[PDB]
Amino acid sequence: SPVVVEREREEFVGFFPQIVRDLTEDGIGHPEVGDAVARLKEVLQYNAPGGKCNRGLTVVAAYRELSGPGQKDAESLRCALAVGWCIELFQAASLVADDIMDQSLTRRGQLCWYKKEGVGLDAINDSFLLESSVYRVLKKYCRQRPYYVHLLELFLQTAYQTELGQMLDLITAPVSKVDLSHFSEERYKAIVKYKTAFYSFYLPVAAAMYMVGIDSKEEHENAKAILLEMGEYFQIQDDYLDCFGDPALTGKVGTDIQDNKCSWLVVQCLQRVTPEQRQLLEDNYGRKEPEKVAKVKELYEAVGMRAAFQQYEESSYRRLQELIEKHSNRLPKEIFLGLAQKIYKRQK
Amino acid sequence: SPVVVEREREEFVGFFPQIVRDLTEDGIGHPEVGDAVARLKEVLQYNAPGGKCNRGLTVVAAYRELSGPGQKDAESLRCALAVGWCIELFQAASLVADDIMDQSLTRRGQLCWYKKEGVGLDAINDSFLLESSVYRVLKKYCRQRPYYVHLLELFLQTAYQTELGQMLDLITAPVSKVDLSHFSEERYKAIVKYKTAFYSFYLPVAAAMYMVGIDSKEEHENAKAILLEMGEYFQIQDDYLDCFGDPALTGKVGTDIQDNKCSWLVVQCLQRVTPEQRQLLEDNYGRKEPEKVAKVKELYEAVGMRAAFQQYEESSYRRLQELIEKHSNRLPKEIFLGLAQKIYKRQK
Numbered sequence: 001s002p003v004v005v006e007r008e009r010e011e012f013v014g015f016f017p018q019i020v021r022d023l024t025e026d027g028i029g030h031p032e033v034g035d036a037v038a039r040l041k042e043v044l045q046y047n048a049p050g051g052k053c054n055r056g057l058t059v060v061a062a063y064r065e066l067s068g069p070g071q072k073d074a075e076s077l078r079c080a081l082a083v084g085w086c087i088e089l090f091q092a093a094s095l096v097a098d099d100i101m102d103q104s105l106t107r108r109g110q111l112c113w114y115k116k117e118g119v120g121l122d123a124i125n126d127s128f129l130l131e132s133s134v135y136r137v138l139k140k141y142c143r144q145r146p147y148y149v150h151l152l153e154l155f156l157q158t159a160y161q162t163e164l165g166q167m168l169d170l171i172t173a174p175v176s177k178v179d180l181s182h183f184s185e186e187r188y189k190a191i192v193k194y195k196t197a198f199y200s201f202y203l204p205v206a207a208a209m210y211m212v213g214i215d216s217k218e219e220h221e222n223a224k225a226i227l228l229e230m231g232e233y234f235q236i237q238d239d240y241l242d243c244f245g246d247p248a249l250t251g252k253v254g255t256d257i258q259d260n261k262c263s264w265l266v267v268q269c270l271q272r273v274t275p276e277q278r279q280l281l282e283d284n285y286g287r288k289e290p291e292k293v294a295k296v297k298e299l300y301e302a303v304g305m306r307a308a309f310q311q312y313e314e315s316s317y318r319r320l321q322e323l324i325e326k327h328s329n330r331l332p333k334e335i336f337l338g339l340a341q342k343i344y345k346r347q348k
Numbered sequence: 349s350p351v352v353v354e355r356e357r358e359e360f361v362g363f364f365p366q367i368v369r370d371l372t373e374d375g376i377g378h379p380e381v382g383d384a385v386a387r388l389k390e391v392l393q394y395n396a397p398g399g400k401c402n403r404g405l406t407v408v409a410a411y412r413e414l415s416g417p418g419q420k421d422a423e424s425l426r427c428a429l430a431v432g433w434c435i436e437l438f439q440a441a442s443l444v445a446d447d448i449m450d451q452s453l454t455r456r457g458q459l460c461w462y463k464k465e466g467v468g469l470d471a472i473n474d475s476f477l478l479e480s481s482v483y484r485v486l487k488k489y490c491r492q493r494p495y496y497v498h499l500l501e502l503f504l505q506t507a508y509q510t511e512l513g514q515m516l517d518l519i520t521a522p523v524s525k526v527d528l529s530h531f532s533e534e535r536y537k538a539i540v541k542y543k544t545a546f547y548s549f550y551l552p553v554a555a556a557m558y559m560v561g562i563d564s565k566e567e568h569e570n571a572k573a574i575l576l577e578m579g580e581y582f583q584i585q586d587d588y589l590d591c592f593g594d595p596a597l598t599g600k601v602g603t604d605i606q607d608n609k610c611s612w613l614v615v616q617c618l619q620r621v622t623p624e625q626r627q628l629l630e631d632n633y634g635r636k637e638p639e640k641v642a643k644v645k646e647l648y649e650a651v652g653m654r655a656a657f658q659q660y661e662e663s664s665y666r667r668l669q670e671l672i673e674k675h676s677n678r679l680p681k682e683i684f685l686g687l688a689q690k691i692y693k694r695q696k
């Protein structure tokens with residue numbers, strides 16, 4: 001709704017300070033670690049809040065769709081919130097990290113934490129502590145709940161798989177030999193599956209599943225099934241709406257290619273190509289010069305992107321629905337729909 | 349003994365490959381993450397093995413002293429081993445990290461992992477995955493044991509506190525204002541308590557305690573009591589044997605001061621000092637120039653270090669014993685002795 005969802009949207013946001021107090025109130029003052037926990041705070045305040053929170057919100061949306069009238073107590077609802085910021089923290093850590101390794105300058109509207117003078121490389125540790133923050137919250141809010149371990153285990157599992165995906169990227173994207181060789185569809189989409197899909201779609205719906213009880217192994221499998229497509233499309237999509245479309249564009253409007261970024265666009269490009277363009281774009285890609293950058297677009301355009309994007313997004317919402325009605329016996333479809341209704345939209 | 353201990357010393361070492369197989373055998377081949385897990389291996393092989401392992405060994409020593417004839421099965425002994433490498437991994441992660449932030453060149457005899465061309469900043473992620481490796485092993489070997497959570501929780505707790513200590517260092521030691529201001533005893537020793545003491549002395553004996561059952565809160569407290577002194581002295585000591593003594597010196601023989609390293613030596617120095625030396629050493633410290641470096645020694649010498657070192661190490665082994673016989677009702681003293689018998693030795 002253009003009503004309830006926004007409210008939840010605000011409950012969650014109203015919850016920060018709390019987690020923030022949670023995280024350090026006691027720390028601020030320890031005649032030993034005091035300085036430390038006080039930095040922690042700002043590392044926390046500068047970094048975590050700032051996205052749309054839609055990841056974290058997701059948990060709360062699902063727990064809502066999943067619990068029963070017994071399990072709607074204030075007390076339950078809080079955790080649902082807690083376990084939410086936990087995903088919102090997980091991602092901070094990560095993206096604080098990514099920033100350093102990618103030597104970026106800007107994030108979510110402001111300057112990278114590593115960039116703040118005084119800070120620099122120390123961010124490596126600040127990242128590590130954001131990571132901790134996550135298991136410091138779950139411990140506080142869930143430690144006495146049948147699903148504690150299931151949660152400890154989920155988060156911990158997911159960081160590994162994501163750490164792998166990231167780790168994949170790094171290798172795949174390097175300007176030593178720049179290369180458009182090892183930009184394989186199968187590779188791209190493995191980068192996708194692992195660096196964003198798990199922590200972005202699975203971890204929260206799944207975390208909702210364990211808190212109401214559904215700890216069935218092949219029920220998690222029936223989730224992973226559906227959601228991973230959605231995480232794939234979603235990223236593919238986020239890939240198009242970066243160069244191929246603009247009107248009212250949210251997230252961050254502007255663009256890349258300057259960054260040798262492995263992106264559906266290119267991948268697609270590189271196989272509707274011939275030795276002529278193949279060098280055209282393999283030449284002026286990954287480089288930030290208005291002719292080039294603005295020129296590689298041309299080639300994409302020269303090959304016809306919004307087509308495959310179309311025969312893409314056309315195929316998915318199809319594939320998706322099916323996947324639901326083969327994977328949705330035991331879990332309210334309202335869930336995968338909700339995600340749908342706010343994830344599949346596109347721009348020509 | 350100049351016998352059994354070395355054998356354990358070798359059982360443990362013989363255990364690596366295994367953990368190594370554990371960690372990746374299945375991974376090496378996944379037609380998605382394969383490249384990733386294959387790098388993982390070498391990140392693993394280059395980094396983890398190489399110390400003396402005395403940290404990890406400690407666990408096994410304690411479990412041995414602690415279990416009963418029922419709990420000496422091969423199967424139990426293995427975990428004891430497993431949970432050992434887990435500390436050996438925890439520290440890799442860490443020190444891979446420290447290397448980058450400190451811009452060092454060399455480690456445990458070889459060149460830093462970040463330094464290997466091709467690698468560089470990617471190490472930030474390699475560190476993160478070494479971290480994971482730790483919860484990937486405990487899950488494999490303990491997941492079905494009453495103390496699983498107690499262990500998950502111990503490791504996780506300890507990284508936080510250590511991450512804080514590290515985080516303390518960073519702040520305390522910076523050459524913007526270089527400073528010998530915020531080199532406070534109380535600060536130093538807080539850096540000690542938190543960046544090395546917990547993961548070096550508490551985490552393994554404690555982990556031994558939870559695996560035999562002693563999960564008594566004020567029994568952990570009776571451990572933390574004793575061991576933390578030992579971790580303090582131990583580091584203080586490691587501090588003296590770096591500049592003040594040399595014959596047959598183990599770990600790494602050579603030295604520092606080049607590194608504005610906060611070290612008992614200095615701290616001590618800086619309060620048996622006057623405005624004259626105070627600038628002498630506050631001048632030529634943290635700097636690598638044979639006059640200086642070799643000159644600040646002089647001042648230490650000019651103030652008389654091996655004295656306090658003496659009235660130090662003299663006071664401790666005292667304080668220590670007491671702490672044992674006030675903290676050792678429920679836990680075999682043979683344990684804190686063993687650590688003693690191989691931690692307190694000194695060099696004039």
Ligand SMILES: CC(C)=CCC/C(C)=C/CC/C(C)=C/COP(=O)(O)OP(=O)(O)O
Pocket residue numbers: 090093094095097098102131158159160162163166169195196473476
């Ligand atoms: C759990 C954990 C702490 C893992 C450590 C490894 C790490 C730094 C992973 C990055 C995850 C991620 C979403 C990166 C951003 O992608 P991107 O390269 O596309 O950069 P972008 O957001 O600027 O587009």
Ligand SMILES: CC(C)=CCC/C(C)=C/CC/C(C)=C/COP(=O)(O)OP(=O)(O)O
Pocket residue numbers: 125128438441442443445446450479506507508510511514517543544
């Ligand atoms: C658990 C975890 C992954 C924490 C991340 C934070 C981090 C990098 C901590 C460093 C711990 C440590 C023993 C550093 C070495 O000390 P040192 O500066 O004295 O350097 P040195 O060994 O060369 O003497």
Ligand SMILES: [Mg+2]
Pocket residue numbers: 098099102103104
């Ligand atoms: Mg980046």
Ligand SMILES: [Mg+2]
Pocket residue numbers: 446447450451452
């Ligand atoms: Mg270092």
